[PDB]
Amino acid sequence: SVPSQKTYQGSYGFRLGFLHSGTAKSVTCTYSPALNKLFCQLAKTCPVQLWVDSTPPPGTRVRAMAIYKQSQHMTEVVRRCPHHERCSDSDGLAPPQHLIRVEGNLRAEYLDDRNTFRHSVVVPCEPPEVGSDCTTIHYNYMCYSSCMGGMNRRPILTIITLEDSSGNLLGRDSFEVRVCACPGRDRRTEEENLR
Template sequence: MSRQRKRPIAYVVEELDTFDAAGSSSQENISIGNAIDDIPMEPMAFLQGLNSGNLMQFSQQSILREMMLQDIKTQINSLPKLENHNNEDYNFSMVLEEPPKSHWMYSEPLNKLYIRMNKTFNIDATFKIKMPIQPLNLRAFLCFVKDVSGPVLRCQNHMSTDPIKDDPSKRESLLRCENPNATYCGTAEGKSIGERYSVLVPLNLSRPSQHSGGLVRQTLVFSFSCQNSCFGRKETCLVFCLENNNGDILGQHVLLLKICTCPKRDRNMDERQLEKNKIKSLSAASEDDEVDGPDAKRKYRRTMTQDIKEEVESNDSNDMPFVPADWQVSRTLDGDYRLVIKCEQKDMLLQSIEGIIEKAAVASLRNPQSSKLRQHVNNLLNLKKCAQKLP
């Protein structure tokens, strides 16, 4: 910037000397005026407008800015914060586009990736090129949502069967990257961003494409060598950090993650649960807004129904559930299970049997080779016929 400001000033001096020698003052004024108009005056005007009060404010802002930059530089040596941010205006983000008939799923309302173990997925890193251009890296690592200090490690069962033997750092890393020049960092005891297991990938500062809005877009390929069930089904996330060569974090993007055997089923279940929670919260809010009037009975019925449902759920989760005295649950000597219930009405008995038949039929369809399940369904159907003949 300083060089650009010196060029117009030098131009004015040369023109002044030339016109002095020629003795033409009118052209001198015109040339000097045009040259001075080209000089950017914003910094001068800014400095002239400063008084003692805002000079102090300017100094304080500079100190605060230095403190913020120092905090950014030390983030790599601190525990991760699970939030998206851009500290240096790089417009950094990660773009995940689910292809048709894929072995992984993405839930947009949950911002969550569902994928099978040892299956790859593509994700694009987008960022803006800033001057002066400096080499940038992308760091990716896994983190527990409710315990950011706990390192995410591979289980011994999968590690013992891993074919990779010559690269211990890659063998112990749960996250794998297929991009060339990717390096594996960290140790099993590491808790900070720079010390925990992570993958560091250099980013190519290629020209931005017209379709990406002027941003550089680079595709990265990752996979996972364990499942969530390997570490107690804890909720996990995948953290992406944009860094320079000094290790300063310039941007961060967080993506929730579940590594499972059936991504489509788990995504649908989580999205249905999300919708139920939304409906429940809206229903609770509407009930709080209601007052005594024509809808008082309806509100009372909804409240009673909700109380009964919560009571049933609490009984189901209790370690010592309540069982009526005329019901019996036991296990026979040959290892089978025995259930005896007593119903006051015939319809309730038939509905209970039909519910058991439905569950058994679904299990039989999923396991068509199981003769025991087919026999169990037939026994239940005969039981229903006998119950229908009761007076």
């Protein structure tokens, strides 16, 4: 009833990486290592790096799923709010209910779990291009953390799983996400509160 969020590098040394985008008030996506938390604007590009120590087998995939961070909400499926699920901002592939989309990858698949009813988006695990040491997936988050009737100000985590071709676990990592109007200011504020 609750997906695991335990960090697990596995046999391939799987882990995420994030750019260093800063906290200017204009920034659209920014990652806080101190908070392990990504702050982003609605529907803007969120680059997430995938790092491995060795190449996983052909057919390996990478899945993203959101859960509520607070235990008392963790069994509730994270979905878009009653407004956003109806705003016809379809990209042609993502169901309108799904919070997390993958940008610019026609091989992305969206799953509505027949048992848990949770949403996820999965793509094939690509090898780095020549001259590159990692691969990057571009995610979009399609509701604000504040959306009423949806996340409703509750924080979420995104869980990224490296999977084999059967969907078995190879690796796992995660990060908190806040989708908000001013990620730079909010990151600064929360890092200050932590200090």
